[PDB]
Amino acid sequence: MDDDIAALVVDNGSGMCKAGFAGDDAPRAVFPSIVGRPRHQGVMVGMGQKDSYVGDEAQSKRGILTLKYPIEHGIVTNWDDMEKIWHHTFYNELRVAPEEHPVLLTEAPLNPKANREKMTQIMFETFNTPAMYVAIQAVLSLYASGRTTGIVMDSGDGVTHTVPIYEGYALPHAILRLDLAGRDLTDYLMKILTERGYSFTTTAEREIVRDIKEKLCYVALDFEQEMATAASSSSLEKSYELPDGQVITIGNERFRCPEALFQPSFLGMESCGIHETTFNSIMKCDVDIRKDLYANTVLSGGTTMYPGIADRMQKEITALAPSTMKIKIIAPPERKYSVWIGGSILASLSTFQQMWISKQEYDESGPSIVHRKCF
Amino acid sequence: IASTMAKDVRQFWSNVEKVVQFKQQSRLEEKRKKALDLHLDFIVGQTEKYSDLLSQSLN
Numbered sequence: 001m002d003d004d005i006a007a008l009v010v011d012n013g014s015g016m017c018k019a020g021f022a023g024d025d026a027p028r029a030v031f032p033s034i035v036g037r038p039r040h041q042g043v044m045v046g047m048g049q050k051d052s053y054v055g056d057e058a059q060s061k062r063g064i065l066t067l068k069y070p071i072e073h074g075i076v077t078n079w080d081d082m083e084k085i086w087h088h089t090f091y092n093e094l095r096v097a098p099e100e101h102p103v104l105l106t107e108a109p110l111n112p113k114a115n116r117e118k119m120t121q122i123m124f125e126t127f128n129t130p131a132m133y134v135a136i137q138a139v140l141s142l143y144a145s146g147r148t149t150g151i152v153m154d155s156g157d158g159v160t161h162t163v164p165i166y167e168g169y170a171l172p173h174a175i176l177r178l179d180l181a182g183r184d185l186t187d188y189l190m191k192i193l194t195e196r197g198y199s200f201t202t203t204a205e206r207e208i209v210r211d212i213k214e215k216l217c218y219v220a221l222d223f224e225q226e227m228a229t230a231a232s233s234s235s236l237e238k239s240y241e242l243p244d245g246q247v248i249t250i251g252n253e254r255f256r257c258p259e260a261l262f263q264p265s266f267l268g269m270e271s272c273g274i275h276e277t278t279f280n281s282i283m284k285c286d287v288d289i290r291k292d293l294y295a296n297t298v299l300s301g302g303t304t305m306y307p308g309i310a311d312r313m314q315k316e317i318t319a320l321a322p323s324t325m326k327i328k329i330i331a332p333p334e335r336k337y338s339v340w341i342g343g344s345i346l347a348s349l350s351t352f353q354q355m356w357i358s359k360q361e362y363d364e365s366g367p368s369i370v371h372r373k374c375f
Numbered sequence: 376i377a378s379t380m381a382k383d384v385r386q387f388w389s390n391v392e393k394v395v396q397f398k399q400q401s402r403l404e405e406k407r408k409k410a411l412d413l414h415l416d417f418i419v420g421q422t423e424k425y426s427d428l429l430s431q432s433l434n
Contacts, residue, residue, distance in 0.1 A: 135380075146388045148381045168381025349383040355376070375376050 015157025022347035029093035031055035036065030074108030102131035117367035131356035138163035140342025141300030150296025155303035174284035275316030
């Protein structure tokens with residue numbers, strides 16, 4: 001391979017797919033992880049009818065397209081639509097030929113082997129890449145936060161994971177999973193805003209409520225004190241202008257929504273909160289490395305962009321962990337992209353160029369080569 | 376595999392720490408420059424003030 005060829009880096013998020021080239025400081029493209037198909041025939045006469053649509057183009061046509069996600073809870077669920085996301089990534093967003101660039105992919109931890117093999121087969125037989133690789137999203141987040149030892153709380157859209165890592169070794173015996181992230185939080189926000197009298201049920205309204213979630217919600221340091229203040233004072237309420245010009249006032253829902261991360265009981269889930277997920281994950285590791293994990297607890301992914309979440313997690317893990325452990329949350333400003341930035345760093349290193357699956361090795365070995373290369 | 380992915384990322388961040396070391400070195404050299412100029416000006420003005428007084432003694 002010519003040393004001047006920059007590899008493509010693609011982040012397979014459940015909410016938004018991200019894309020760019022190795023060595024960039026940030027992804028060049030980000031778009032919803034959706035493929036759309038017409039709700040009825042004959043609607044789009046004269047507007048260039050297609051069998052399906054992808055990304056922003058499909059998102060703006062939500063009113064006439066049924067929309068489906070090929071990536072759900074961090075796992076791929078529809079491979080034709082996954083190929084269409086990758087097609088949109090290569091040809092429509094990045095505008096390059098994938099057979100001319102190596103491609104690095106991201107995945108959820110503990111991703112089933114069949115999915116990895118199918119990704120490998122699609123990349124080498126459909127897109128004919130000269131090389132490709134796969135890596136865990138949380139691990140790339142730790143790399144982007146400049147670290148090789150630490151535990152990452154990686155929260156995208158449809159799922160959260162807590163991933164302890166020792167000198168780059170991800171540790172499956174201590175990884176924990178939590179089927180709860182911004183998607184579930186948006187549903188809960190729809191619920192409590194409907195209880196507030198601002199009824200939101202349609203597929204379009206759900207995105208307005210996601211915008212409210214992104215702009216106005218925050219993690220409070222003390223849930224009880226915050227509730228008391230909201231009930232005794234209206235200073236916590238914020239105005240939001242709906243697309244039709246109607247202004248609605250959002251109150252305690254700002255923090256009741258993300259609180260489900262720490263107390264999943266609000267959702268009816270008998271599950272650990274993100275603080276407990278991280279704490280128990282650390283406590284499943286060997287005692288000697290728990291101190292380093294406590295000192296290097298990293299938050300990553302789009303769901304972690306709230307205010308105050310770092311402080312709340314720090315408080316919770318200081319209260320849970322032994323007094324001897326020097327707890328420290330790390331929450332970078334670009335942590336929504338750290339998943340992808342780690343791949344940029346990884347794929348641009350000269351010593352990493354030995355780690356690829358090559359087209360030759362795939363032809364010699366088949367998809368199972370992924371179990372010998374990618375982790 | 377994980378060790379290679381750890382060592383190359385560690386080399387990357389070691390380069391980053393080297394760059395931060397260069398930034399800190401730049402600020403320390405700025406500090407050296409201003410400190411040196413300040414007390415050089417002081418001691419020259421002092422020994423040249425001590426020489427004008429000595430010249431006052433010389434009649």
